[PDB]
Amino acid sequence: NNLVETTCKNTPNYQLCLKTLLSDKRSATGDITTLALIMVDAIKAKANQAAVTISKLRHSNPPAAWKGPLKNCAFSYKVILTASLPEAIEALTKGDPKFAEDGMVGSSGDAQECEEYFKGSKSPFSALNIAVHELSDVGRAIVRNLL
């Protein structure tokens, strides 16, 4: 809790970081690596939600103009889920945290990339892309403590 408060103060979104870390039993005892791992899991949950939302849209007779955006968003979230976040978990757990930082930079940029495909028009899961981006930037800040 005092570790959590200190850690969260040194992120771009204090209350988001607080709610996320304190949602997980592991924070009430976990060290800073543990806090990073909790944040990775939060990003993971939102990325899985986005991946499924994209599949639903793509199978629901979407507007023709969303064909490219949605295909590239699906690719974006597949990178996050199969590469960026598994890389961060492994690196935090048993390796070099620099690679977890890379993973968070990746997921932050990939969620932003997906959102920006809908520029000029309605973005159908905007809040979700924003959530993944903001949580990634919080995680990046947390992991920076280990570097």
Side-chain angles (χ1 to χ4, degrees), residues 44-65:
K44 195 190 305 193
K46 288 303 197 176
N48 276 133
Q49 182 181 346
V52 170
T53 298
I54 295 161
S55 180
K56 288 176 179 183
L57 283 167
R58 289 177 80 196
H59 293 274
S60 280
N61 191 31

Side-chain angles (χ1 to χ4, degrees), residues 27-102:
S27 62
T29 36
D31 64 353
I32 190 270
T33 294
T34 295
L35 304 183
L37 293 168
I38 292 166
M39 191 61 42
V40 178
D41 285 354
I43 300 166
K44 195 190 305 193
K46 288 303 197 176
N48 276 133
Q49 182 181 346
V52 170
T53 298
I54 295 161
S55 180
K56 288 176 179 183
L57 283 167
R58 289 177 80 196
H59 293 274
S60 280
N61 191 31
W66 288 3
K67 185 189 201 89
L70 290 172
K71 189 168 180 180
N72 289 143
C73 289
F75 180 82
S76 199
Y77 284 98
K78 186 175 186 194
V79 168
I80 295 177
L81 291 166
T82 67
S84 308
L85 304 180
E87 176 193 12
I89 295 175
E90 179 159 1
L92 286 164
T93 302
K94 46 183 196 162
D96 175 0
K98 182 269 189 303
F99 301 125
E101 186 62 27
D102 293 352

Side-chain angles (χ1 to χ4, degrees), residues 17-33:
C17 178
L18 280 186
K19 194 191 165 74
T20 304
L21 296 182
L22 298 176
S23 282
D24 195 306
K25 52 164 183 91
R26 295 180 285 168
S27 62
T29 36
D31 64 353
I32 190 270
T33 294

Side-chain angles (χ1 to χ4, degrees), residues 65-141:
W66 288 3
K67 185 189 201 89
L70 290 172
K71 189 168 180 180
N72 289 143
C73 289
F75 180 82
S76 199
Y77 284 98
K78 186 175 186 194
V79 168
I80 295 177
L81 291 166
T82 67
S84 308
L85 304 180
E87 176 193 12
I89 295 175
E90 179 159 1
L92 286 164
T93 302
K94 46 183 196 162
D96 175 0
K98 182 269 189 303
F99 301 125
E101 186 62 27
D102 293 352
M104 304 283 79
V105 168
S107 55
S108 175
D110 290 353
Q112 189 106 249
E113 196 76 357
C114 169
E115 177 67 7
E116 294 173 334
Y117 295 145
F118 297 92
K119 167 171 148 178
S121 81
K122 161 154 214 150
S123 174
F125 48 94
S126 181
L128 200 39
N129 287 323
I130 294 162
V132 170
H133 175 71
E134 287 184 338
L135 288 166
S136 299
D137 289 356
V138 161
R140 156 160 210 198

